[PDB]
Design a protein around this ligand. Structure first.
Ligand SMILES: Nc1ccc2c(NC3CC3)nc(-c3ccccc3)nc2c1
Ligand SMILES: O=C(OCc1ccccc1)c1cccnc1
Length: 329
């Protein structure tokens, strides 16, 4: 049987949650999140109430997508689902979705020491290895999507353009997983210097700042570009030379500089992968081949489906029903 719920009004919204969760306190406003005490585990959790989860086809599918993704993620450097619930007793009543996860400290968004940079980028790459092994691309990696507790343990959660790979800016539709490695490079650079590596004011400025560091594309990359207008734009630009990173990141650990060179390669095909970066010398004190696990296969065949609102809603409901809490250990 389902547990006993209780209503209350927090900020704007009504909140109907199981008695299990106590002392709800707002932490910000996709949906709004409350901090809470979980009486079953004795841990602090974050409860997210999705807003209007089924108000349109796209909302409906987004709701399903988010629930599917969170139910899949089981890795210490990625956000996972402690609980999901609805106060509804039937599919017909069903209109609210709440998700529960570990309350984490602040987000990553100062100049940090080299050992702090090592450990944090290590953990990001370890989560990303896992995510990527599932054929999931994060696409929106940035400091505010990284939660860090006082113990410097990090979990991947969820201007965006500052961390975006140049092939996304240029609107290539066949970009792949290494768009995330680009973002890691921009994050790591920012941690090491205390400044945004590429703080473009728009998408055009963004590219200009990028190419000025990494150089304008050579013939070899230009020959893989299918869009004539895209090729025209970059081919019409002032041909910047690739900068010496050891000069640009003056004083940083030479191994950090070398990893940055391998992450921030213009050509997506020659960018280091998550698994490869983990074996890089910069992470010598943290890397362990037997504790960098891959994920179970993830079925995202639903991404290609076009369904009705009630159908996405019903798929989401099934997923709420089949949820198995993770082991209390
Ligand atoms: N194998 C590849 C590797 C890199 C690529 C890239 N990279 C952009 C220079 C940063 N851009 C594009 C592309 C194609 C059509 C429209 C817009 C962009 N394709 C690429 C194909
Ligand atoms: O804003 C937060 O809640 C987000 C969230 C995301 C997914 C499921 C439940 C809650 C949050 C995340 C990590 C630490 N503290 C709060």
């Amino acid at each position: 049987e389902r547990p006993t719920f209780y209503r209350q009004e927090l900020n704007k919204t009504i909140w109907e949650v199981p008695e299990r969760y106590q002392n709800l306190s707002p932490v910000g406003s996709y949906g709004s999140v409350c901090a809470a005490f979980d009486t079953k585990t004795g841990l602090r959790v974050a409860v997210k109430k999705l807003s209007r989860p089924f108000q349109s086809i796209i909302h409906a599918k987004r709701t399903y997508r988010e629930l599917r993704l969170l139910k899949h993620m089981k890795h210490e450097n990625v956000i996972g689902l402690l609980d999901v619930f609805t106060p509804a007793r039937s599919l017909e009543e069903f209109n609210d979705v709440y998700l529960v996860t570990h309350l984490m400290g602040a987000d990553l968004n100062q100049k940090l020491t080299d050992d702090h940079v090592q450990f944090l980028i290590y953990q990001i790459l370890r989560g990303l290895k896992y995510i990527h092994s599932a054929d999931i691309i994060h696409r929106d990696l940035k400091p505010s999507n990284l939660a860090v507790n006082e113990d410097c343990e990090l979990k991947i959660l969820d201007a965006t353009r500052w961390y975006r790979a140049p092939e996304i800016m240029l609107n290539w539709m066949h970009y792949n997983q290494t768009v995330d490695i680009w973002s890691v490079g921009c994050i790591m650079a920012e941690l090491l210097t205390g400044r945004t590596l590429f703080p473009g004011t728009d998408h055009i400025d963004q590219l200009k700042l990028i190419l000025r560091l990494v150089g304008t594309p050579g013939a070899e990359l230009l020959k893989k570009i299918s869009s004539e207008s895209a090729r025209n734009y970059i081919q019409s630009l002032t041909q910047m030379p690739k900068m010496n990173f050891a000069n640009v990141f003056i004083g940083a650990n030479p191994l950090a500089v070398d990893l940055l060179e391998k992450m921030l390669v213009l050509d997506s095909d020659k960018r280091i992968t998550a698994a490869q970066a983990l074996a890089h010398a910069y992470f010598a004190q943290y890397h362990d081949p037997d504790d960098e696990p891959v994920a179970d296969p993830y079925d995202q065949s639903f991404e290609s489906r076009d369904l009705l609102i009630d159908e996405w809603k019903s798929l989401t409901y099934d997923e709420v029903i089949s949820f198995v809490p993770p082991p209390l250990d």
